[PDB]
Structure formats: structure tokens, C-alpha cells
Design a protein around this ligand. Structure first.
Ligand SMILES: [Mg+2]
Ligand SMILES: [Mg+2]
Ligand SMILES: [Mg+2]
Ligand SMILES: [Mg+2]
Ligand SMILES: [Mg+2]
Ligand SMILES: [Mg+2]
Ligand SMILES: [Mg+2]
Ligand SMILES: [Mg+2]
Ligand SMILES: [Mg+2]
Ligand SMILES: [Mg+2]
Ligand SMILES: [Mg+2]
Ligand SMILES: [Mg+2]
Ligand SMILES: [Mg+2]
Ligand SMILES: [Mg+2]
Ligand SMILES: [Mg+2]
Ligand SMILES: [Mg+2]
Ligand SMILES: [Mg+2]
Ligand SMILES: [Mg+2]
Ligand SMILES: [Mg+2]
Ligand SMILES: [Mg+2]
Ligand SMILES: [Mg+2]
Ligand SMILES: [Mg+2]
Ligand SMILES: [Mg+2]
Ligand SMILES: [Mg+2]
Ligand SMILES: [Mg+2]
Ligand SMILES: [Mg+2]
Ligand SMILES: [Mg+2]
Ligand SMILES: [Mg+2]
Ligand SMILES: [Mg+2]
Ligand SMILES: [Mg+2]
Ligand SMILES: [Mg+2]
Ligand SMILES: [Mg+2]
Ligand SMILES: [Mg+2]
Ligand SMILES: [Mg+2]
Ligand SMILES: [Mg+2]
Ligand SMILES: [Mg+2]
Ligand SMILES: [Mg+2]
Ligand SMILES: [Mg+2]
Ligand SMILES: [Mg+2]
Ligand SMILES: [Mg+2]
Ligand SMILES: [Mg+2]
Ligand SMILES: [Mg+2]
Ligand SMILES: [Mg+2]
Ligand SMILES: [Mg+2]
Ligand SMILES: [Mg+2]
Ligand SMILES: [Mg+2]
Ligand SMILES: [Mg+2]
Ligand SMILES: [Mg+2]
Ligand SMILES: [Mg+2]
Ligand SMILES: [Mg+2]
Ligand SMILES: [Mg+2]
Ligand SMILES: [Mg+2]
Ligand SMILES: [Mg+2]
Ligand SMILES: [Zn+2]
Lengths: 104, 51, 43
RNA sequence: CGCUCCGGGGACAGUGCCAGGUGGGGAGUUUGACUGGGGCGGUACACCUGUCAAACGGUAACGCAGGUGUCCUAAGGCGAGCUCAGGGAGGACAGAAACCUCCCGUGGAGCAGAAGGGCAAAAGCUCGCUUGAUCUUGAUUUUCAGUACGAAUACAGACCGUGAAAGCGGGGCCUCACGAUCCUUCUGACCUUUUGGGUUUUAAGCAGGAGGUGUCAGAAAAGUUACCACAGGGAUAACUGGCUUGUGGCGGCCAAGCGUUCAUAGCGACGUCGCUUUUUGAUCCUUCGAUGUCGGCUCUUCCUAUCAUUGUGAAGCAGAAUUCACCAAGCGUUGGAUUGUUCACCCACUAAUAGGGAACGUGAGCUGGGUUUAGACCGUCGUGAGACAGGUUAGUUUUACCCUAC
RNA sequence: CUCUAGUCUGGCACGGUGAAGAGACGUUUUUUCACUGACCCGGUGAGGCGGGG
RNA sequence: GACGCGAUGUGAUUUCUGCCCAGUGCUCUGAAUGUCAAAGUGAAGAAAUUCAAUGAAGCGCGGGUAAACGGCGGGAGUAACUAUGACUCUCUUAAGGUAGCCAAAUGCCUCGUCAUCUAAUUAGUGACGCGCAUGAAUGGAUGAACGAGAUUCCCACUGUCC
RNA sequence: UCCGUAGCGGUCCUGACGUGCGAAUCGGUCGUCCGACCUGGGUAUAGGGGCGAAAGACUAAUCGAACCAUCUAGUAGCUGGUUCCCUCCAAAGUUUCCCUCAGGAUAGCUGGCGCUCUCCGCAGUUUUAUCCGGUAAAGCGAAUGAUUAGAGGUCUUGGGGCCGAAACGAUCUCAACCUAUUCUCAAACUUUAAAUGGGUAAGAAGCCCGGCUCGCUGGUGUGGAGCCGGGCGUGGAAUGCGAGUGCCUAGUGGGCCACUUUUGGUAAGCAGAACUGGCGCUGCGGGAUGAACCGAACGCCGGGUUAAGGCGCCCGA
């Protein structure tokens, strides 16, 4: 799909429609000191082998695309997540398609 | 599985050497002052077959 | 159960008889740590 | 006289503890489900359309024909202006088919896809402006237990877009396009806790998205066993027996033709009606706390769809030989080479060498050649253990003295 | 699938005595040549070892 | 103490043992180096911590090895009677099965075809090879002597049988 | 090395025996019998271990992991049993979810305990109004799809021409096309369109007037809704019946058969659905016999009469 890099939409902090910067959300790096990671690290220590399940029967091909929306206001600068439907191809702001032209 | 034949040889008690009729450990004379600074003389008594 | 070469409906090895040097006992049979395994031609 | 017993090594071999690699040598465990037996094959396992479906709704099968795990910054949202498919008649190059113009055109087009429904100053086409595909409570419908998820419908509170405005819009004209707990990650608040208090990192919470379980209400999971084991099942196959008769076998009706002439002496196409269970199927009703599973030998009885023989009718019956048909199962239907064979094929005799049933007659009657345990060899397949209605060889055949029948 | 004996390899300790050299930004890193005294092997009934005369 | 010990394959003698290192194994070489843990070093930070450089073996990279496991093609035209078809072309993989041998204990079709053995033979033997799916130490071919091994025929012998 | 005895072993008869002499023996026939020969005693190796001229053989009649004790009364969605009487009520093999398909949870069906009223309400039913449908049927001179035949047409182009060198000229023709007709069809076609069926209504929780409130809605004490206060009882179709309500709860979750409708299959005592009734759970009379068919359901008896069936004899008539 194709979405632009700018979208005028509601801001929760402003209470109004403001223009936004639209990027793509990506998963952050896993912290070693989250409670579940610490519990997993202490459970996997020693003998007994692998204790938690390891998922292997993957079926889906694409993820849901999340747009990271950021308020362009200097005071606000508030961000939020907005998910769209599953798509194999995704691009931020490129080749705005036209009508009645020659296909080459 | 079962322990294999080449593994069973290191335990012994069947695969030990048959040393009943052997004549002894064949070795050179131990080194001393005579064999370190000069020579010593000995005599060949007999030649035997070691099993 | 008796040897890693035993079994099968045909008397055959079924695996490369050349084996690595650091193999566990009960597996290290055949041709141990062999650099080449053929008829000696030349030197 | 001396200080290591002489040599050979030596700050390294080696030992203790961690770290990475390797590790079926060994240990533990797994190797889905549906299924006209199981396996192989498919997905009828989560969804959607038309039908089945018997005019509310609901309704099954490995029932039929299909589709889905996407695509779209517009193909979402308004507003404006047009009318599509196809056809006819014309116009230089121009022709079947390029472009212009007139007329007819109820949709015969298009609306992303499968199909169905719906739609003409539109829901289609082309433009202009846009982000209602935004935030936030509840309620409702669909599946349904009347629980969730998904999808959907009416509102309400805001901020907006568009249009002159009425209004319309919180995704796609509608019916599918999708995902719990635990964990992780991001976003939100001058938010709460971080423990005897205070500050600051950190961490734990609350709220909303995502990372995914397609066996789709969501275990983390390869085989082989003919060396096999247990609990069971006739809910389920391999024998017989049943129902059925596609297939096999047998018999009719009609008569275009064959028969030198001549449909019907003897045959008989194209059609059509039946019989039988000596063929194989289909099914799974009985039997898995066991009905001994192929042949052959032996022995008795029955059937007729009659090969011969008795008595006869008809011939394209001169005689001889041979065909068709009737009453008819009384009596016969053999000896051998090959193969475990059933079957088949050949030699010979004969009068004829007809077909079958009796738990595919007959293993406490035999035999054990085959099939069908464990030992082995070959070919193919598999990395392997091993597999092969593919060949080859060797492989324990128990008991009657009970009752009945004779 | 998840582990595991054994095995290979790296670090720390046992673990010292000197000489040189190469180093990165005077400590320390590491390479080589040696020493024996920890540690290891062989021999022997631990029998003439090292210097000097 | 290498004329030894340990680990495998094949299975006397005779005659041979062809081709393939692409795959999976085994082995060699290496600061010429991609990945790479702990420990150690450097920097920031109030510190917990974070980041970066260095980065052993092993994987990668390269060579050897088939008496290591194993493997060893397909389609057309072409000799002027028919056919077959040495020869050529083309597609190709690491080669494309060499010497031998065969309806074999290995061949579905198949009771293959021919010859012999019989009066008659799905049996036996000898040839033919298009070989579903033969083949060279996963050993090929042969072969005297030997065998309570499997199979065919003949003489003699007999109640196996009439 | 050969024949062959003692010894060692165990080919064949697939002999005997096979509740045997014997939990592996016996007879004849056989292999070997100077060497990888046979054998006593001592000794070594112990269970995921030994030992194996290799059969998964042997390891005290036990071997593809011996034997003894304990954990242990291991677990079993699986098999078999589960002990006195009478009375009353009385099922289900269906929905949804589950590595669910020989099992559970859930809803349904059942029972028990009651309670709140009675001494209006409710109904596996009809009538009267009012909606819904797309099956049976029918239709193809109505759309879509399939499909048979002639007939009349001009030039709308052609397949063969032919008299024209030739002209939309003569002029036959055959096919596509057009126009009225005609034969035959549709589970996934339809203009029409039943029977049976599915919803609502048939009053007092209704009508009727007056007044009040609203921050909703508005030109308008407009509209809408909610409150009070009164007035109307012939209780506004038939038939029948006392109802309403709350806890706890077992068993079941393999079904099968029949009229009609109906899917797959040539068909099946085949496989799979809908409706109702049965069998299962149920005896009785009849169909000779008999799960389901016809009649009719059941406390113990006497008299009478019937149903479905019958009335020569068995065997009542
Ligand atoms: Mg650890
Ligand atoms: Mg093994
Ligand atoms: Mg192989
Ligand atoms: Mg292992
Ligand atoms: Mg294992
Ligand atoms: Mg299954
Ligand atoms: Mg209906
Ligand atoms: Mg418009
Ligand atoms: Mg709103
Ligand atoms: Mg639209
Ligand atoms: Mg086997
Ligand atoms: Mg098997
Ligand atoms: Mg069993
Ligand atoms: Mg059954
Ligand atoms: Mg049967
Ligand atoms: Mg027939
Ligand atoms: Mg004629
Ligand atoms: Mg059934
Ligand atoms: Mg029985
Ligand atoms: Mg019997
Ligand atoms: Mg007759
Ligand atoms: Mg029989
Ligand atoms: Mg019998
Ligand atoms: Mg018997
Ligand atoms: Mg046999
Ligand atoms: Mg066998
Ligand atoms: Mg007696
Ligand atoms: Mg070899
Ligand atoms: Mg070779
Ligand atoms: Mg290689
Ligand atoms: Mg050849
Ligand atoms: Mg013969
Ligand atoms: Mg031959
Ligand atoms: Mg080969
Ligand atoms: Mg071979
Ligand atoms: Mg001898
Ligand atoms: Mg002898
Ligand atoms: Mg016997
Ligand atoms: Mg007896
Ligand atoms: Mg006696
Ligand atoms: Mg031991
Ligand atoms: Mg032995
Ligand atoms: Mg075996
Ligand atoms: Mg079960
Ligand atoms: Mg049961
Ligand atoms: Mg319908
Ligand atoms: Mg009809
Ligand atoms: Mg049925
Ligand atoms: Mg009942
Ligand atoms: Mg009854
Ligand atoms: Mg009757
Ligand atoms: Mg009475
Ligand atoms: Mg009667
Ligand atoms: Zn803002």
C-alpha cells in the first residue's frame, strides 16, 4: 500500500486536528532487565534444558503495519500508534499514481 | 545399545595377555658406573623361545 | 545394538567408515582419523 | 669438599573452576485429527457465495460449482458534471479493428477479486477539495451456550473534511479477507508503587496498538519394528455367511441384415426386458476372552444351464458325419509331461473326456508344495533402523475316553 | 525435540628466576632465548654425581 | 614397541578390479580472514549499566582422498530391397556402466525367443541381451577338491503306485 | 587327509510320543572322530552390565535388557463385576467448545426440595384481520442458458457460380444475418405462482379528558417523552386448562426403524438429511414365526362388549 508522510489528524494532547509526521513503527531491542526476561534467564539456568515453548509452526506471511504518528507542534510533540490492515508491500510517500496516462 | 567389542577390551579379564609361559620382561641391563664409564663383559648361556 | 555398522536387509555399512578423531567410544570404529582411504599408488 | 639419589623434561604437560564448539557413545520424550478399515491421496480442520434445503429460520455426507489468507492515499470521504456495453448511418489516408460526428440504446457495461444481491441527473466515468481509515463511552445484531474473537448496525460526546445548503462521512455498495492468557516492544499521564524516610536512574503497574498460535477457542515434537509388548474393539479391515448385481455368466422380445434366392434351418446389428450367485466388486449386519486362513489327495450327496448314452422333434437332414430343440441328472465323464496351483497348455485313449454346489464341502482326515513369524542371499528404495501381492532357501500341523450322527 | 559422559579450545589459579625485543594509549600487553625450586617421567638393592687435587 | 598393537572392509587359488571428489563423510593448510563465548582492555555515565575495539577452537574459504559412504544419461537423422544401423547432430551432469556376466538366488512384461532334453515340459541345460532394476574388494568372472546346502536328467533298484 | 568305533553332535523320516519316559525324550538313518577335538575340577568377567567363529544367541526351564525386595494399593478416556423389598416420577444418543472422534465441559431432556398467589392468566388448536416467502406447479410467441424444424425477406457482408472485361447489373443459389412462427428443457433460470407453513393483533399494562415538567426538539404553551388528577367494566372471538417462580440435581451426549419429502450410489437389510410417530425403555390381541407392521399401551379380579384380525380341522368362532 501507499500512505503519505504527512497526515492531518486528531491529537489527544491538543484536543484538535493537527498535521502529523508519519513513520513506520519497528520493534525495539529487548531489554535484559525486564521481569519476564529475568525470570526466563533464571529458569533456563542450570539443568533441565529448554523450559518455555519455542514456536515453530509459523503460518502468516506479513505483519500488520503500524504508523507512528507524531505531532508537528513544538509544544506538543506527542506520538501514538495507528495500525492498518495486513499488506505484503508498504511504502511511505512514493509515486502518487495518476489517471489517463500512457502505460509503458 | 549394547557396549561394543572394542570397548569391552579395556576392562580386561578376558582380553588380558596370556603371560603364563612367558620367560620374563626382555630388557637391557641397567645403567651403572661400569656401563657409563667403561664396559662390562657377560656370557650368552642359552637362546630361548618366548611364547 | 552390537555395532554402529550392523543391521539392514543387506550386509552394508550405510555410513562413511572414515570417522573423526574426537569421536566417542562405541562410535569410533572403521577407519579412524583417515587422511586418505584408497589403494596405495605411488608414495 | 659439597645443597638436591642419578638422568630426562619444566612455568609448560597436568589438576581445580568457568566459557564456546563437538557429541544418537548415552538418557528422556514426541512423531495431530477427519476418514465408507488403516496407509497413500485430499482438507470436507478457520472463513465466504449459489445450490442441496422440501416458498419463515435452521438442517448432513471425502454432496455439486467456486473463491480466501490479498488489494487500495485511493479503489476511503464529500461535491459537481456526464452516461455505459453494443448497434446503425456517415467522414482523406483508414482497411474487421486507430479518430470525429449524429441517432437508437432499462443497463445487455462498470463497480479490485469467487458468486449472488444492489445501483443511471448513480454506487459507474472524469475532475476539485480532502483524511470520518482520527479520539472516546456505553448499547445492539451476527456465530452462539445466547460465551468470546472476528465482522457489522443504530446512537451519544469531541474535533474535522466536503458542499451554497439540506446533508453525507468515524474505511472500501452489502455478504469473507483473520487471532486469548504468559512474555516482549511502542505510545499516553507534572499518573501510582519501588517498602524506615527524601532525591535521581532503574524496575513493577494502569490504558491503548503490535510481535502468533492456518490443527485458525491457540502443546514446543522425525522414523522403524517380520524381535515385539499391554488395555481393548467385531464401533474397524483381511475368511465364510447375508442384502445388492455395477462387472462376470446365462436366457429372452423386436427384426435392419448374413445365409447364391430367403428376416426368423442356423445366426443376428441398433435397442430393450430378465434370471443366477460357480467371477470380481460395493457394503460392514455376525465373529477379534480366536469359527484353523490356498491347493492337492480321499469320500459321500445334491443341482441342471445335457458332453455322451435311452426316447424324440427340426435342418441349408440323400447316406455318413454334424448342428438346433424337448422329456430327461438313471449311469458315466479317464491315464499322463509342465506348474504349489485354481486356471491354463500339450500327448494319448475314449462314448464323452459337460458345467457346478455342499462354511469358495472336506487340516482332533492327511499333506505342507504355496501363502503367512523368527535365520539368510539378490534386485530396487531409504542417510539409517528397515520396506517391497519382487524373486530364492530352511523352517514343531496338539487332544476325543464326553454328547449326538453314522 | 531437549539434554549428557567423553573430547577440542580460551580464561583464572597452583605458577616462580632472569635476559633481550616488539608494543597500545612511566604502568601494562605479549614473542623468543635460557634457569630450577613447585610439578611430571624413567632407572636403581636411590653404588662411585658436580667441581677440585 | 611398527615383521608390534589397535580399528575396518573383502573372503582360498587363477584372472582382473574401469570412470566419478559434484553430494555426504574423513583429512590437511591458515592472523592471507567473514562469523565467533567467557575472561581481559578502552570510553561515557552518580553507579547499576551501555557502547566500541580485540576476538581461541569450531563453522565458512581452499587442496587431497572412492580396496570412504556411494553413484555411473536422454532424443533424432544416417549403408540406393526390408530392417538393424558402425557414423553425425543436439540436450546435458561430478561422471554417464569399462572388462565381464545374465530371464541368474537378480527380468515386471514372461510360461521372453531359438536350440536340446520328452509322446507331451510354467521345470533343467546351452545360447540371444532391448539389462522394470547385472557389474567389478557395497567385489566381477572363473574354478579342482569338498558339502546331512538348492535344482534337472539318465542307469540300476524297488508296494511310491496300478 | 578318507571309511569307521568309543566320545562329541543332531540331517531326514517333517517317524514314535505329543493330559508323553521326558516343561524337548526315543528309534532307524546321519555329521565329525589328531585337531579350530572332547571333558572334570579350580578361577575371571554381573544386568543397559557381562559374554558372543554373531543366532539378538547365552547369562540357573526366565533374555530385543535376568532374578528378589521396595517405591506400589504406580496410572488406565479401556474390560469385567457392583449384594433387601415396595411405592411415585422418569430420560438421552441433540447444540457449542476442546490434539475433541471409545472421553469431558456446556445447553437441552429428568428428579427432588419448595415458595408466591388462585380457590386474571396460559395453550404443539381453531376462527377473524394483517404481513412474509419463491418450493410444487407453470413459462420459454417474457430476460439468461440450452435447443429442433420449415416459411418469408432485402442486400447486410459471404461460401459455389454464371451471362456480363465490367457497375447496388442479369440472376439462380446456398450458409451465416433479419422477421413472424414451431418442437423440446433448467438443483446452482425466471415474468407468474399455490397447498402446508412462519410472525403480530383480538383491551383495564386499554381508551379517554384536564393540568404540570424538560437542559431534547422546534416559526408557533410547536412536537415528543415523562409525571399527576379524574371518568369509562357488556373483562370486547371459539374451545379447553389452576398458574407463576427459585434453588440443587443424576443419567445421557455410539442410536436404529417406518409414511411422506429428499442427497450420493446400478443397487443394497448401503451411506447421509427434514417432519412426525415408534423401537430403544414396552408388556398385550393379530400378522404361523418376529425390536420397529395393524390394533391397543399394562395395579389384582368377576360380568358384558369391541379394535386389528379372523370363523373346514389343528384352533375359540
Ligand atoms: Mg549452565
Ligand atoms: Mg548405534
Ligand atoms: Mg543405498
Ligand atoms: Mg548423541
Ligand atoms: Mg535415543
Ligand atoms: Mg486417525
Ligand atoms: Mg420450509
Ligand atoms: Mg452526484
Ligand atoms: Mg459523531
Ligand atoms: Mg466507493
Ligand atoms: Mg525380516
Ligand atoms: Mg512391516
Ligand atoms: Mg493385545
Ligand atoms: Mg460390525
Ligand atoms: Mg462377506
Ligand atoms: Mg450383465
Ligand atoms: Mg438377403
Ligand atoms: Mg452403519
Ligand atoms: Mg467364540
Ligand atoms: Mg470347527
Ligand atoms: Mg432341462
Ligand atoms: Mg473351504
Ligand atoms: Mg473338520
Ligand atoms: Mg490339523
Ligand atoms: Mg513350506
Ligand atoms: Mg522369514
Ligand atoms: Mg476302551
Ligand atoms: Mg572397503
Ligand atoms: Mg572400483
Ligand atoms: Mg569430497
Ligand atoms: Mg555392457
Ligand atoms: Mg520332470
Ligand atoms: Mg539359462
Ligand atoms: Mg550396482
Ligand atoms: Mg550389486
Ligand atoms: Mg580328518
Ligand atoms: Mg572322516
Ligand atoms: Mg515328527
Ligand atoms: Mg496319542
Ligand atoms: Mg515306561
Ligand atoms: Mg563394567
Ligand atoms: Mg562359539
Ligand atoms: Mg534379526
Ligand atoms: Mg477414549
Ligand atoms: Mg465399550
Ligand atoms: Mg430457495
Ligand atoms: Mg417444476
Ligand atoms: Mg440410514
Ligand atoms: Mg418413552
Ligand atoms: Mg409397543
Ligand atoms: Mg407372514
Ligand atoms: Mg374381560
Ligand atoms: Mg387363524
Ligand atoms: Zn499535539
Amino acid at each position: 500500500v501507499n500512505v503519505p508522510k504527512t497526515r492531518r489528524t486528531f491529537c489527544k494532547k491538543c484536543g484538535k486536528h493537527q498535521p502529523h509526521k508519519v513513520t513506520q513503527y519497528k520493534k525495539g531491542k529487548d531489554s535484559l532487565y525486564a521481569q519476564g526476561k529475568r525470570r526466563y534467564d533464571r529458569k533456563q539456568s542450570g539443568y533441565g534444558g529448554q523450559t518455555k515453548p519455542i514456536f515453530r509452526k509459523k503460518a502468516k506471511t506479513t505483519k500488520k503495519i503500524v504508523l507512528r504518528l507524531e505531532c508537528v507542534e513544538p509544544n506538543c510533540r506527542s506520538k501514538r500508534m495507528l495500525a492498518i490492515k495486513r499488506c505484503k508491500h508498504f511504502e511511505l510517500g512514493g509515486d502518487k499514481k495518476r489517471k489517463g496516462q500512457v502505460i509503458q | 545399545g549394547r557396549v561394543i567389542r572394542g570397548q569391552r577390551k579395556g576392562a580386561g579379564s578376558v582380553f588380558r595377555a596370556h603371560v603364563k609361559h612367558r620367560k620374563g620382561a626382555a630388557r637391557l641391563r641397567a645403567v651403572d658406573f661400569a656401563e657409563r664409564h667403561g664396559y662390562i663383559k657377560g656370557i650368552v648361556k642359552d637362546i630361548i623361545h618366548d611364547p | 545394538v552390537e555395532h554402529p555398522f550392523g543391521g539392514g536387509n543387506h550386509q552394508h555399512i550405510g555410513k562413511p567408515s572414515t570417522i573423526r578423531r574426537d569421536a566417542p567410544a562405541g562410535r569410533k570404529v572403521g577407519l579412524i582419523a583417515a587422511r586418505r582411504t584408497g589403494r596405495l599408488r605411488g608414495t
